[PDB]
Amino acid sequence: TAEAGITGTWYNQLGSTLIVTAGADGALTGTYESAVGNAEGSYVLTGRYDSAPATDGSGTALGWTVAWKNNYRNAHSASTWSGQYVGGAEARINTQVLTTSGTTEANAWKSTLVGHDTFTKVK
Numbered sequence: 001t002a003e004a005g006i007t008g009t010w011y012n013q014l015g016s017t018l019i020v021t022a023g024a025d026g027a028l029t030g031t032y033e034s035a036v037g038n039a040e041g042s043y044v045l046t047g048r049y050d051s052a053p054a055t056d057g058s059g060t061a062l063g064w065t066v067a068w069k070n071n072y073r074n075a076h077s078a079s080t081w082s083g084q085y086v087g088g089a090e091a092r093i094n095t096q097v098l099t100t101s102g103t104t105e106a107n108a109w110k111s112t113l114v115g116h117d118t119f120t121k122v123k
Contacts, residue, residue, distance in 0.1 A: 002051065002060035003024055006085050039075065049061065060084055062084065063082040076102045077100060078100055079099040
């Protein structure tokens with residue numbers, strides 16, 4: 001469904017790679033490899049998607065998180081992508097992304113970045 005459409009490899013506009021499996025009951029699981037930031041190698045990704053989307057031409061809502069810790073790096077931060085999958089010949093996952101770093105309370109006002117990421121099936 002959107003299950004078949006979402007499962008697989010996606011590439012963002014910055015050169016990052018998402019490899020994700022969409023489970024039949026709403027789970028997203030896989031890995032992320034970032035082309036930017038204090039990051040190297042792959043990181044675990046987990047999220048959710050609407051496993052019964054509308055059929056009226058609407059996208060399929062989804063989101064996921066990556067905490068930026070693996071065996072090679074820990075940036076003490078985590079990003080969440082919120083967006084929708086749009087299927088078909090030019091499939092895309094269009095997202096907004098929040099990246100929060102751990103901070104002191106005094107620096108909490110500057111703890112969270114906002115950005116946007118568009119993923120496509122080809123590099």
